[PDB]
Swiss-Prot record, chain A:
Glycosylation sites: 37
Protein name in UniProt: Spike protein S2'
Function: Subunit of the fusion protein that is processed upon entry into the host cell. Mediates fusion of the virion and cellular membranes by functioning as a class I viral fusion protein. Contains a viral fusion peptide that is unmasked after S2 cleavage. This cleavage can occur at the cell membrane by host TMPRSS2 or during endocytosis by host CSTL. In either case, this triggers an extensive and irreversible conformational change that leads to fusion of the viral envelope with the cellular cytoplasmic membrane, releasing viral genomic RNA into the host cell cytoplasm.
Length: 49, 50
């Protein structure tokens, strides 16, 4: 859950692999795209509530 | 005998230089540890929530 600890973006899962004198991590990460604009609002009033 | 005197001076100065180099290495290692901690704090607390 800590950001940027494993990969760049949201984290899903990982796989390790060996090396001659170390380890190699493969991270699977999720990244959004294709945004829009829209118009927002904080709350909706109805019947005074 | 100039060579004897020069040998004395060289060995003394070289020993002092080696001591200084070792102390610098230790201090640099400590600073590297602190820099890693600072980088982790900056990456985790600024760009998100802890």
């Amino acid at each position: 859950k800590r950001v940027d600890f494993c990969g760049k973006g949201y984290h899903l899962m990982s796989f390790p692999q060996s090396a001659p004198h170390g380890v190699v991590f493969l991270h699977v990460t999720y990244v959004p795209a294709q945004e829009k604009n829209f118009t927002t609002a904080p709350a909706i009033c109805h019947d005074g509530k | 005998e100039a060579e004897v005197q020069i040998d004395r001076l060289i060995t003394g100065r070289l020993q002092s230089l080696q001591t200084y180099v070792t102390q610098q290495l230790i201090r640099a290692a400590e600073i590297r540890a602190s820099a890693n901690l600072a980088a982790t704090k900056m990456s985790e607390c600024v760009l998100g929530q802890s």
